[PDB]
Amino acid sequence: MVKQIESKTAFQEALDAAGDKLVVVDFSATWCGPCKMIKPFFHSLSEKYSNVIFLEVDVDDCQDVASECEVKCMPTFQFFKKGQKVGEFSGANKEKLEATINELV
Amino acid sequence: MVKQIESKTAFQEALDAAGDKLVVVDFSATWCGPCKMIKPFFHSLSEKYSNVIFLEVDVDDCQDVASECEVKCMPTFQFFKKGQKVGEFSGANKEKLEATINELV
Structure with a gap:
């Protein structure tokens, strides 16, 4: 499921706990139309x-x-x-x- | 000099009062490094x-x-x-x- 990151400490911690797994980060903004468009597909x-x-x-x-x-x-x-x-x-x-996810996993 | 826009109404008004002149709008974000880098040159x-x-x-x-x-x-x-x-x-x-400013002016 998608983990909402609300600090630099939570970002670092998540990249440590992922272990061996690929981590995909979506950097988005509420105002940006393309960001809203792709959010259901990302989830x-x-x-x-x-x-x-x-x-x-x-x-x-x-x-x-x-x-x-x-x-x-x-x-x-x-x-x-x-x-x-x-x-x-x-x-x-x-x-x-x-x-890209299927190339890197 | 650079006019700071703080509403949709002030943006529309500025594009109306410019008359015949070219208007260059810099859309920036405080967090974005390239935005800080080019601000003195824009001014x-x-x-x-x-x-x-x-x-x-x-x-x-x-x-x-x-x-x-x-x-x-x-x-x-x-x-x-x-x-x-x-x-x-x-x-x-x-x-x-x-x-681009010298092509469009």
Whole structure:
């Protein structure tokens, strides 16, 4: 299911507890239309792939996590494995979200 | 100089009062590193080009202006002439900002 991140401490903790699993982070903003458009599909991916951790970071609540991860477009999806960023793209592209998850898992 | 926009009503009013002049709008966010990087150069362009109107819209204060203008990356510069959008690009590129202003003025 999708884990809502509300601090830098909760982000770090989640990337530590994921262990060996792929972590997909959706960086979004409430004002951004493409972000609202892809939110149901992002939550469907979390029920389909139980072996992948799905995080949501609202850039307005976690401005510090947003700056440190160098987010500049909404939505941006960053992919992490064992604390290292292994992929990233921006845009509400459903096919490419799922396709990148199947390459990295 | 740069006019800080704090409502949809002030945005509309500014695009009406510009008359015939080019209007350059910088859509920015406080958390976004490239936005901070280009802010002095954007304010220098406003002192150099007195025949062009320079607006700043913080997407966090004007979420409604941000959604309606379909902003998705920070910074985004939109260019208007007589209320019509005539150019747009995203990214903190100094050369391309000034170069687009000289094409459209």
